[PDB]
């Protein structure tokens, strides 16, 4: 159906321990496909998915040059951020960026993104119009004025409507065996006595791709939001994801509870119960 491409930058200053580290990771959907680390023995963009390997040497050189230039730019950005927030040169700070595009089933642009953060807080973002900015504070407003003067949004827009969608379409074709394959969850309910009169029911989803999933418990057909323990979706390390949802229920009432599972790999949502 729909798909996304995102690049994520982390630039971390480290006074006393060299120049700030710069890391880039690139994803299509929930699949890592490229990385760059300025601390690498010989820093280059490196493939992390089989389908990007067929890109030619020109690709790798160009992509590597972008990352080396950005290492310098984001180092400059860290210095500028110090000035804008009146901060000392003694502390460690982080700038993050996430940017990319979403496309529909027809491959047309659904929306573009380009956002930055400073020390984990929103700093500046390209608006959905790809024409204007939202600045988080008076420091970011300085950046906004510079970017407005230099027509940076127009540059973003031309990328997000052109190269971003074009390259993503090609990756989706080259990787169709995996990027266009949903693996549904394998599901089961376990039952663990807590004590004479309480039991934990745990609803498991395993082996699914992509990561997006919904797991809910009902009691007598009523969602149990407040009483459900839900773990964060976690990577299995084989491309797939895992998740579970758990409720504590009175002994002898197990059958009043049903686990409901939604995932794009399922033709219909699943309903599961403890199977004694």
């Amino acid at each position: 159906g729909s798909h996304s491409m995102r690049y994520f930058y982390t630039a971390m200053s480290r006074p006393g321990r060299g120049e700030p580290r710069f890391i880039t990771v690139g994803y299509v959907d929930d699949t890592l496909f490229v990385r760059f680390d300025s601390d690498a023995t010989s820093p280059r963009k490196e493939p992390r998915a089989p389908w990007i390997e067929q890109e030619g040497p020109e690709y790798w050189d160009r992509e590597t040059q972008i990352s080396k230039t950005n290492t310098q730019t984001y180092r400059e950005n860290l210095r500028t951020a110090l000035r804008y927030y009146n901060q000392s040169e003694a502390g460690s700070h982080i700038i993050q960026r996430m940017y990319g595009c979403d496309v529909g089933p027809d491959g047309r642009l659904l929306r573009g993104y380009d956002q930055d953060a400073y020390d984990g807080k929103d700093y500046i973002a390209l608006n959905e119009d790809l024409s204007s900015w939202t600045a988080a504070d008076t420091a970011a407003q300085i950046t906004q004025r510079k970017w407005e003067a230099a027509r940076v949004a127009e540059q973003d827009r031309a990328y997000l409507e052109g190269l971003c969608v074009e390259s993503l379409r090609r990756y989706l074709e080259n990787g169709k065996e995996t990027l266009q394959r949903a693996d549904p969850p394998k599901t089961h309910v376990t039952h663990h006595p807590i004590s004479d009169h309480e039991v934990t029911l745990r609803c498991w989803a395993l082996g699914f791709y992509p990561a997006e999933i919904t797991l809910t418990w009902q009691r007598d057909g009523e969602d149990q939001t407040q009483d459900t323990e839900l773990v964060e979706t976690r990577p299995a390390g084989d491309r797939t994801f895992q998740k579970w949802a758990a409720v504590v229920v009175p002994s002898g009432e197990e059958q009043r509870y049903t686990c409901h599972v939604q995932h794009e790999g399922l033709p219909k949502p699943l309903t599961l119960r403890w199977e004694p």
Binding site: Y7, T24, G26, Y59, R62, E63, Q65, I66, S67, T69, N70, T73, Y74, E76, N77, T80, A81, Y84, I95, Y99, I142, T143, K146, W147, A150, V152, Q155, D156, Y159, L163, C164, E166, S167
Partner: peptide, 9 residues
């Protein structure tokens, strides 16, 4: 493919 232009803060 990345965007090759990165404006300074």
């Amino acid at each position: 493919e990345e965007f090759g232009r990165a404006a300074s803060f």
